[PDB]
Amino acid sequence: MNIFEMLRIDEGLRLKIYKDTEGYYTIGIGHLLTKSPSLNAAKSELDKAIGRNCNGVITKDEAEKLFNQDVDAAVRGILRNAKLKPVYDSLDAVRRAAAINMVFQMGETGVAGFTNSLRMLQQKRWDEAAVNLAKSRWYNQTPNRAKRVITTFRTGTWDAYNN
């Protein structure tokens, strides 16, 4: 297990534009295209991202390319964020993957807003952190996914992903 396999489990793989859990146009492995309700706007973003006229459909190789970029972008987001970087630097590799997962799903700004959880994580108060993390819109809207990510922070194991 690693961050790629983890996110592939959490996000799935779809080769045609679909709507994510928030109703937003998405493709591939959780590649958000736009928050606009315009399918045409989403198709335009897709064509810009892939570099050809795709008419809403991509290949598996293209999906994996966008995914690799998106994982890289999440890590970059963390390292450039003054709230996230000290916590990330404090974590072991397994828990780092949990943090990347969160940023992938919610964005850098959104995760930087989990001030109290981040402090508990930095303190290595894992059970406390896990309780605090679940007091969130995130948990309430995507509870099975959030439970997996929280288990990963709580235990520093991949036990929630041995599917």
Residue numbers in the entry: 1 to 163
Authors' text:
To demonstrate the versatile applicability of spitrobot-2 we demonstrate reaction initiation and fast delay times in three independent model systems, obtained by single crystal rotation data collection: Streptomyces rubiginosus xylose isomerase (XI), human insulin (HI), and bacteriophage T4 lysozyme (T4L). It is suitable for monitoring ligand binding events as well as conformational changes of main and side chains.
The L99A mutation of T4L forms an internal non-polar cavity of about 150 Å3, which allows the binding of various ligands after large conformational changes that open T4L to allow ligand binding. As a result, this particular mutant serves as a model system for studying ligand binding at allosteric sites. Our spitrobot-2 cryo-trapping data clearly show that structural snapshots of the binding event can be obtained at delay times (1 s) inaccessible by manual methods.
